RNA sequence: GAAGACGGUCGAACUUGACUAUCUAGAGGAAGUAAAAGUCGUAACAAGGUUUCCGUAGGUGAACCUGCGGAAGGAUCAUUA
RNA sequence: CGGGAAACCAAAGUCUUUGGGUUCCGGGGGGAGUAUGGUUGCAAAGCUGAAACUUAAAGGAAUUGACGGAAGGGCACCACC
RNA sequence: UCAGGGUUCGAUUCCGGAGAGGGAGCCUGAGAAACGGCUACCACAUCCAAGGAAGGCAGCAGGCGCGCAAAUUACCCACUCCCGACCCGGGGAGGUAGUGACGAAAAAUAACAAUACAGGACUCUUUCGAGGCCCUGUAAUUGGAAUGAGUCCACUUUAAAUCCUUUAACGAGGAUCCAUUGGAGGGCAAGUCUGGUCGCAGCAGCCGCGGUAAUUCCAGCUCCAAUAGCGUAUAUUAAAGUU
């Protein structure tokens, strides 16, 4: 009732081809970042009555 | 060594409707964080609770009279509150903006001397603003009534006079060493 | 209303309540000091022990996996306890005769998930944090 | 990449008694994809999974055939005696 | 007017039993539990093909069977003479 | 009327508009009416009554099919006659 | 811990009580059954030329052991007070610095135009089309406009210093003077992703995911939330009208 194996321990982590870090930008300091959020969310942000939309969408 | 907390988080944590409300407040009010709002939602709840207790007391009741009038007078000195209000029946029917409206940051906008709730906070936190003999760097301040008029740039920050700027003064000597001579 | 209503009857009401509190399991646990007396951890929140052996435990249906815990002798009271080793290949990081910091599931003493009869998890070895080890912030020192 | 096994006895409910050709009797658990259409027998070849766990036990993954058994001499697994 | 010293009182401590409370080792043994996808029977979900179940006693590979008194939560809210 | 989750209930009513008197038992399900001590018993047994561990549903009610070696049921030579 | 009722804790900056290795006894003195007094036994430990002899950090530091867990073998009697024969001395009382994300307060890591554009309510026009206010981004770099974090003459602090609160000389074009920690299937805020795997590794408090188009995994990308903090474990409380 245990017997069995571990041979396979860590098989996916070790098979998952590493990815670069890439990079890019810094996102913004405290209140300024809050400000960008508020303009992007609300000012931005006009929205349509498209019956809605999304934040982390592709096509 | 006595100390106390100054803010309180909301029972609950994800109520789109509340989140949007707070974000609009941060934006209008050049705020920094939710705590920044939470701190005020907290300030207000205690005031309202202070108010509600009082309002349940008998009028003329030395305790209700002596402390009610005081709460009101305190609330008015800061402009937070007005006279008809200026009784307890009106504080009960009050809100956060009314406080939020009295901080530095939004005033330095409100009379040109910033043109942004933005500009305002970096101005304040950078020492270019006195409330009359005194620099005040606390974008978080709370401008008292007859103190509204004494807010202005400071005696030396450049506007306010005084040479230029550790970066302006760099630039003057930036057209000096090369383009003048060798 | 199952409960006298006489101005006097404080003692009956007070006492009837004392009598029924028992059935509350959290209450009884506390008054019987169970945490001190039965429990492997002292009535403390964390506990450190030595690794005896590595177990591959057979996750309960409808799930199917080999679980991967160690068996640990707690230094404090020589108690024998099996503890889960979380994340991918982390067994790797604990060896027999190891030392380890164990902590509760967050289940109130009740085993977690599909993982059968295991009530604790490893947190530190190399005195050294499986998390920091798994990431590679820090190593299997030696 | 391990050896195989040989069922010796049956238990029932995700339990079967096997006898590893190497001389190790343990209780192997049927495989999930195999059990779908495979019903281990008390007399047949099988493959069970076993890793860093003393090997005292193993789980059944797939099964085998018989007719091929005569070919097993060709499988290079069983000796001139199986 | 000291050491010492007669006898006593308090009495730590020590030695041996008794007492009470709390805790704890243990070859092995027998329960219950999990539980569960196993083996042997069909005991009592469709009248489960022996209606079911309770109290109780005796007995059986095993579910269970059976007598004696209950209940319907039954398969009858009726019986028409 | 009103109650209740409903089945139902003139009491199971007068219960969030929660307060007539008093008594008893329960706090998820299993472990268990079990262990252990006390008590009563000639005996069989009865009363009081845990835990470790186990587990995410146990359970209730109504609704609907499916299905029945339940009742009235039908229909067809893929059923019988 | 907040409806109200309540619910739980309290060794711990004060008050009252108790002890200074365990037990017992006693001297002195107004006050002690005192242990930075003594004395015996009992348990412990130490020096020795072996006959002897000397000791008690639940004081301040520090050290061992223990553990989930806890700081300098630092400076001063100047403050605050205390004691003595005392204005004057003495105080690990106490202050002072060092360590210090228990935890609590303030809240930096970038603001303003301009072109440049991307856009929407407003107006004009039959439409096409154009104007227009409120502006936000988003680059393009500009352009002038900025401040301590560091660094540092001087000065302050104070017993003397440190730091704060003070400032000449320096210190912001992003590749920074470089913000984090959890989450993104449901509850639950946020990928009807791309590569990889294929009920494997893992995820998952609970329900549940993964058996080859994985929105739960493993990674990136992207996005969310709380933010100089955030996750995790645990006692306990609220939620719980499940005492």
PDB file of C-alpha atoms in Angstrom, chain B:
ATOM      1  CA  UNK B   1       4.027  54.924  25.147  1.00  0.00           C
ATOM      2  CA  UNK B   2       0.319  54.614  24.359  1.00  0.00           C
ATOM      3  CA  UNK B   3      -0.541  54.179  20.680  1.00  0.00           C
ATOM      4  CA  UNK B   4      -3.539  53.475  18.489  1.00  0.00           C
ATOM      5  CA  UNK B   5      -4.357  52.398  14.907  1.00  0.00           C
ATOM      6  CA  UNK B   6      -5.707  55.070  12.563  1.00  0.00           C
ATOM      7  CA  UNK B   7      -7.490  53.059   9.856  1.00  0.00           C
ATOM      8  CA  UNK B   8      -9.813  50.102   9.404  1.00  0.00           C
ATOM      9  CA  UNK B   9     -10.230  47.750   6.441  1.00  0.00           C
ATOM     10  CA  UNK B  10     -13.667  46.828   5.086  1.00  0.00           C
ATOM     11  CA  UNK B  11     -15.346  43.745   6.299  1.00  0.00           C
ATOM     12  CA  UNK B  12     -15.109  42.381   3.054  1.00  0.00           C
ATOM     13  CA  UNK B  13     -12.874  42.547   0.368  1.00  0.00           C
ATOM     14  CA  UNK B  14     -14.196  42.212  -3.148  1.00  0.00           C
ATOM     15  CA  UNK B  15     -17.382  44.276  -3.878  1.00  0.00           C
ATOM     16  CA  UNK B  16     -16.706  45.814  -7.281  1.00  0.00           C
ATOM     17  CA  UNK B  17     -19.108  48.532  -6.380  1.00  0.00           C
ATOM     18  CA  UNK B  18     -17.012  49.629  -3.363  1.00  0.00           C
ATOM     19  CA  UNK B  19     -13.676  49.251  -5.235  1.00  0.00           C
ATOM     20  CA  UNK B  20     -14.738  51.605  -8.039  1.00  0.00           C
ATOM     21  CA  UNK B  21     -15.952  54.177  -5.562  1.00  0.00           C
ATOM     22  CA  UNK B  22     -12.562  54.065  -3.797  1.00  0.00           C
ATOM     23  CA  UNK B  23     -10.653  54.355  -7.087  1.00  0.00           C
ATOM     24  CA  UNK B  24     -12.574  57.466  -8.109  1.00  0.00           C
ATOM     25  CA  UNK B  25     -11.633  58.920  -4.708  1.00  0.00           C
ATOM     26  CA  UNK B  26      -7.912  58.110  -5.194  1.00  0.00           C
ATOM     27  CA  UNK B  27      -7.998  59.704  -8.613  1.00  0.00           C
ATOM     28  CA  UNK B  28      -9.819  62.917  -7.752  1.00  0.00           C
ATOM     29  CA  UNK B  29      -7.750  62.804  -4.673  1.00  0.00           C
ATOM     30  CA  UNK B  30      -4.372  62.376  -5.689  1.00  0.00           C
ATOM     31  CA  UNK B  31      -4.359  59.641  -3.071  1.00  0.00           C
ATOM     32  CA  UNK B  32      -1.726  56.943  -2.930  1.00  0.00           C
ATOM     33  CA  UNK B  33      -3.395  53.755  -1.653  1.00  0.00           C
ATOM     34  CA  UNK B  34      -6.530  52.141  -0.538  1.00  0.00           C
ATOM     35  CA  UNK B  35      -5.241  52.522   2.898  1.00  0.00           C
ATOM     36  CA  UNK B  36      -5.177  56.174   2.003  1.00  0.00           C
ATOM     37  CA  UNK B  37      -8.893  55.871   1.497  1.00  0.00           C
ATOM     38  CA  UNK B  38      -9.396  53.282   4.197  1.00  0.00           C
ATOM     39  CA  UNK B  39      -7.857  55.650   6.718  1.00  0.00           C
ATOM     40  CA  UNK B  40     -10.597  58.155   5.971  1.00  0.00           C
ATOM     41  CA  UNK B  41     -13.454  55.638   5.816  1.00  0.00           C
ATOM     42  CA  UNK B  42     -12.216  54.815   9.343  1.00  0.00           C
ATOM     43  CA  UNK B  43     -11.893  58.419  10.537  1.00  0.00           C
ATOM     44  CA  UNK B  44     -15.458  58.998   9.381  1.00  0.00           C
ATOM     45  CA  UNK B  45     -17.017  55.931  10.994  1.00  0.00           C
ATOM     46  CA  UNK B  46     -15.799  57.020  14.406  1.00  0.00           C
ATOM     47  CA  UNK B  47     -17.093  60.548  13.898  1.00  0.00           C
ATOM     48  CA  UNK B  48     -20.447  59.172  12.812  1.00  0.00           C
ATOM     49  CA  UNK B  49     -20.490  56.850  15.858  1.00  0.00           C
ATOM     50  CA  UNK B  50     -19.554  59.733  18.159  1.00  0.00           C
ATOM     51  CA  UNK B  51     -22.455  61.626  16.511  1.00  0.00           C
ATOM     52  CA  UNK B  52     -24.991  58.826  16.730  1.00  0.00           C
ATOM     53  CA  UNK B  53     -24.419  58.317  20.446  1.00  0.00           C
ATOM     54  CA  UNK B  54     -24.893  61.978  21.194  1.00  0.00           C
ATOM     55  CA  UNK B  55     -28.031  62.160  19.088  1.00  0.00           C
ATOM     56  CA  UNK B  56     -29.649  59.517  21.286  1.00  0.00           C
ATOM     57  CA  UNK B  57     -29.068  61.643  24.384  1.00  0.00           C
ATOM     58  CA  UNK B  58     -31.501  64.246  25.740  1.00  0.00           C
ATOM     59  CA  UNK B  59     -30.978  67.808  24.513  1.00  0.00           C
ATOM     60  CA  UNK B  60     -29.937  70.165  27.300  1.00  0.00           C
ATOM     61  CA  UNK B  61     -28.321  67.190  28.968  1.00  0.00           C
ATOM     62  CA  UNK B  62     -25.139  68.621  30.363  1.00  0.00           C
ATOM     63  CA  UNK B  63     -23.293  65.636  28.787  1.00  0.00           C
ATOM     64  CA  UNK B  64     -25.044  66.054  25.403  1.00  0.00           C
ATOM     65  CA  UNK B  65     -24.763  69.861  25.482  1.00  0.00           C
ATOM     66  CA  UNK B  66     -21.142  70.056  26.602  1.00  0.00           C
ATOM     67  CA  UNK B  67     -19.831  67.423  24.175  1.00  0.00           C
ATOM     68  CA  UNK B  68     -22.215  67.910  21.258  1.00  0.00           C
ATOM     69  CA  UNK B  69     -21.402  71.611  20.912  1.00  0.00           C
ATOM     70  CA  UNK B  70     -17.695  70.667  21.149  1.00  0.00           C
ATOM     71  CA  UNK B  71     -17.878  68.040  18.463  1.00  0.00           C
ATOM     72  CA  UNK B  72     -19.622  70.531  16.263  1.00  0.00           C
ATOM     73  CA  UNK B  73     -17.232  73.372  16.959  1.00  0.00           C
ATOM     74  CA  UNK B  74     -14.295  71.040  16.243  1.00  0.00           C
ATOM     75  CA  UNK B  75     -15.933  69.875  13.002  1.00  0.00           C
ATOM     76  CA  UNK B  76     -16.467  73.437  11.877  1.00  0.00           C
ATOM     77  CA  UNK B  77     -13.018  74.804  12.638  1.00  0.00           C
ATOM     78  CA  UNK B  78     -11.731  72.395   9.981  1.00  0.00           C
ATOM     79  CA  UNK B  79     -14.471  73.225   7.515  1.00  0.00           C
ATOM     80  CA  UNK B  80     -15.523  70.027   7.327  1.00  0.00           C
ATOM     81  CA  UNK B  81     -18.907  71.035   8.717  1.00  0.00           C
ATOM     82  CA  UNK B  82     -21.393  73.930   8.381  1.00  0.00           C
ATOM     83  CA  UNK B  83     -23.962  75.468  10.875  1.00  0.00           C
ATOM     84  CA  UNK B  84     -27.540  73.961  10.407  1.00  0.00           C
ATOM     85  CA  UNK B  85     -25.368  71.064  10.254  1.00  0.00           C
ATOM     86  CA  UNK B  86     -23.471  72.581  13.178  1.00  0.00           C
ATOM     87  CA  UNK B  87     -26.078  70.565  14.966  1.00  0.00           C
ATOM     88  CA  UNK B  88     -25.664  66.615  15.326  1.00  0.00           C
ATOM     89  CA  UNK B  89     -28.821  65.989  13.269  1.00  0.00           C
ATOM     90  CA  UNK B  90     -26.764  67.126  10.282  1.00  0.00           C
ATOM     91  CA  UNK B  91     -23.499  65.241  10.916  1.00  0.00           C
ATOM     92  CA  UNK B  92     -25.583  62.086  10.730  1.00  0.00           C
ATOM     93  CA  UNK B  93     -26.463  62.992   7.166  1.00  0.00           C
ATOM     94  CA  UNK B  94     -22.733  63.705   6.169  1.00  0.00           C
ATOM     95  CA  UNK B  95     -19.583  62.117   4.076  1.00  0.00           C
ATOM     96  CA  UNK B  96     -15.768  61.350   3.334  1.00  0.00           C
ATOM     97  CA  UNK B  97     -15.237  63.901   0.540  1.00  0.00           C
ATOM     98  CA  UNK B  98     -16.066  66.585   3.121  1.00  0.00           C
ATOM     99  CA  UNK B  99     -12.813  65.601   4.939  1.00  0.00           C
ATOM    100  CA  UNK B 100     -10.787  64.606   1.900  1.00  0.00           C
ATOM    101  CA  UNK B 101     -11.562  68.110   0.567  1.00  0.00           C
ATOM    102  CA  UNK B 102      -9.520  69.792   3.345  1.00  0.00           C
ATOM    103  CA  UNK B 103      -6.114  68.086   2.869  1.00  0.00           C
ATOM    104  CA  UNK B 104      -3.248  70.091   1.457  1.00  0.00           C
ATOM    105  CA  UNK B 105      -2.731  68.406  -1.966  1.00  0.00           C
ATOM    106  CA  UNK B 106      -6.127  69.361  -3.331  1.00  0.00           C
ATOM    107  CA  UNK B 107      -5.805  73.002  -2.299  1.00  0.00           C
ATOM    108  CA  UNK B 108      -2.518  73.636  -3.979  1.00  0.00           C
ATOM    109  CA  UNK B 109      -4.419  72.664  -7.104  1.00  0.00           C
ATOM    110  CA  UNK B 110      -7.572  74.509  -6.104  1.00  0.00           C
ATOM    111  CA  UNK B 111      -5.811  77.899  -6.309  1.00  0.00           C
ATOM    112  CA  UNK B 112      -3.811  77.599  -9.534  1.00  0.00           C
ATOM    113  CA  UNK B 113      -0.374  77.072  -7.252  1.00  0.00           C
ATOM    114  CA  UNK B 114      -0.242  73.532  -8.649  1.00  0.00           C
ATOM    115  CA  UNK B 115      -2.776  72.840 -11.488  1.00  0.00           C
ATOM    116  CA  UNK B 116      -3.108  69.127 -10.495  1.00  0.00           C
ATOM    117  CA  UNK B 117      -3.794  67.117  -7.381  1.00  0.00           C
ATOM    118  CA  UNK B 118      -0.624  65.547  -8.748  1.00  0.00           C
ATOM    119  CA  UNK B 119       1.646  68.322  -8.968  1.00  0.00           C
ATOM    120  CA  UNK B 120       0.310  69.275  -5.542  1.00  0.00           C
ATOM    121  CA  UNK B 121       1.564  66.194  -3.647  1.00  0.00           C
ATOM    122  CA  UNK B 122       5.071  66.289  -5.145  1.00  0.00           C
ATOM    123  CA  UNK B 123       5.141  70.021  -4.400  1.00  0.00           C
ATOM    124  CA  UNK B 124       4.186  69.429  -0.824  1.00  0.00           C
ATOM    125  CA  UNK B 125       6.420  66.479  -0.198  1.00  0.00           C
ATOM    126  CA  UNK B 126       9.266  68.475  -1.732  1.00  0.00           C
ATOM    127  CA  UNK B 127       9.245  71.402   0.696  1.00  0.00           C
ATOM    128  CA  UNK B 128       7.803  74.124  -1.574  1.00  0.00           C
ATOM    129  CA  UNK B 129       4.785  75.132   0.535  1.00  0.00           C
ATOM    130  CA  UNK B 130       4.506  76.892   3.843  1.00  0.00           C
ATOM    131  CA  UNK B 131       1.424  77.394   5.957  1.00  0.00           C
ATOM    132  CA  UNK B 132       2.663  80.884   6.821  1.00  0.00           C
ATOM    133  CA  UNK B 133       5.956  80.676   8.852  1.00  0.00           C
ATOM    134  CA  UNK B 134       6.188  76.908   8.492  1.00  0.00           C
ATOM    135  CA  UNK B 135       7.060  74.495   5.695  1.00  0.00           C
ATOM    136  CA  UNK B 136       4.569  71.612   5.666  1.00  0.00           C
ATOM    137  CA  UNK B 137       5.531  68.398   3.894  1.00  0.00           C
ATOM    138  CA  UNK B 138       2.532  66.445   4.933  1.00  0.00           C
ATOM    139  CA  UNK B 139       0.422  66.108   1.847  1.00  0.00           C
ATOM    140  CA  UNK B 140      -1.653  64.461   4.367  1.00  0.00           C
ATOM    141  CA  UNK B 141      -2.162  68.209   6.634  1.00  0.00           C
ATOM    142  CA  UNK B 142      -5.799  69.364   7.102  1.00  0.00           C
ATOM    143  CA  UNK B 143      -6.043  73.071   6.450  1.00  0.00           C
ATOM    144  CA  UNK B 144      -7.962  74.928   9.143  1.00  0.00           C
ATOM    145  CA  UNK B 145     -10.347  77.718   8.197  1.00  0.00           C
ATOM    146  CA  UNK B 146      -8.647  81.016   8.960  1.00  0.00           C
ATOM    147  CA  UNK B 147      -5.491  79.269   7.872  1.00  0.00           C
ATOM    148  CA  UNK B 148      -6.682  78.939   4.261  1.00  0.00           C
ATOM    149  CA  UNK B 149      -5.133  82.265   3.285  1.00  0.00           C
ATOM    150  CA  UNK B 150      -1.594  81.639   4.633  1.00  0.00           C
ATOM    151  CA  UNK B 151      -0.688  78.813   2.319  1.00  0.00           C
ATOM    152  CA  UNK B 152       1.966  79.791  -0.199  1.00  0.00           C
ATOM    153  CA  UNK B 153       5.353  78.843  -1.563  1.00  0.00           C
ATOM    154  CA  UNK B 154       8.156  78.889   0.919  1.00  0.00           C
ATOM    155  CA  UNK B 155      10.980  81.421   1.588  1.00  0.00           C
ATOM    156  CA  UNK B 156      13.361  79.627  -0.448  1.00  0.00           C
ATOM    157  CA  UNK B 157      12.681  77.009  -2.844  1.00  0.00           C
ATOM    158  CA  UNK B 158      13.255  78.763  -5.792  1.00  0.00           C
ATOM    159  CA  UNK B 159       9.810  79.829  -6.438  1.00  0.00           C
ATOM    160  CA  UNK B 160       9.568  81.520  -3.329  1.00  0.00           C
ATOM    161  CA  UNK B 161      12.705  83.071  -4.696  1.00  0.00           C
ATOM    162  CA  UNK B 162      16.219  81.917  -3.836  1.00  0.00           C
ATOM    163  CA  UNK B 163      18.871  81.210  -6.458  1.00  0.00           C
ATOM    164  CA  UNK B 164      17.670  78.506  -8.863  1.00  0.00           C
ATOM    165  CA  UNK B 165      17.766  74.742  -8.352  1.00  0.00           C
ATOM    166  CA  UNK B 166      20.459  72.185  -7.573  1.00  0.00           C
ATOM    167  CA  UNK B 167      19.596  71.248 -11.152  1.00  0.00           C
ATOM    168  CA  UNK B 168      18.882  74.723 -12.511  1.00  0.00           C
ATOM    169  CA  UNK B 169      22.090  75.923 -10.824  1.00  0.00           C
ATOM    170  CA  UNK B 170      23.805  72.980 -12.558  1.00  0.00           C
ATOM    171  CA  UNK B 171      22.514  74.296 -15.902  1.00  0.00           C
ATOM    172  CA  UNK B 172      23.714  77.870 -15.317  1.00  0.00           C
ATOM    173  CA  UNK B 173      27.233  76.476 -14.959  1.00  0.00           C
ATOM    174  CA  UNK B 174      26.364  74.311 -17.968  1.00  0.00           C
ATOM    175  CA  UNK B 175      26.571  77.354 -20.360  1.00  0.00           C
ATOM    176  CA  UNK B 176      29.361  78.740 -18.160  1.00  0.00           C
ATOM    177  CA  UNK B 177      32.414  76.460 -18.228  1.00  0.00           C
ATOM    178  CA  UNK B 178      32.281  75.453 -21.930  1.00  0.00           C
ATOM    179  CA  UNK B 179      30.588  78.261 -23.906  1.00  0.00           C
ATOM    180  CA  UNK B 180      32.055  81.124 -21.853  1.00  0.00           C
ATOM    181  CA  UNK B 181      35.819  79.796 -21.669  1.00  0.00           C
ATOM    182  CA  UNK B 182      38.431  76.576 -21.185  1.00  0.00           C
TER     183      UNK B 182
END
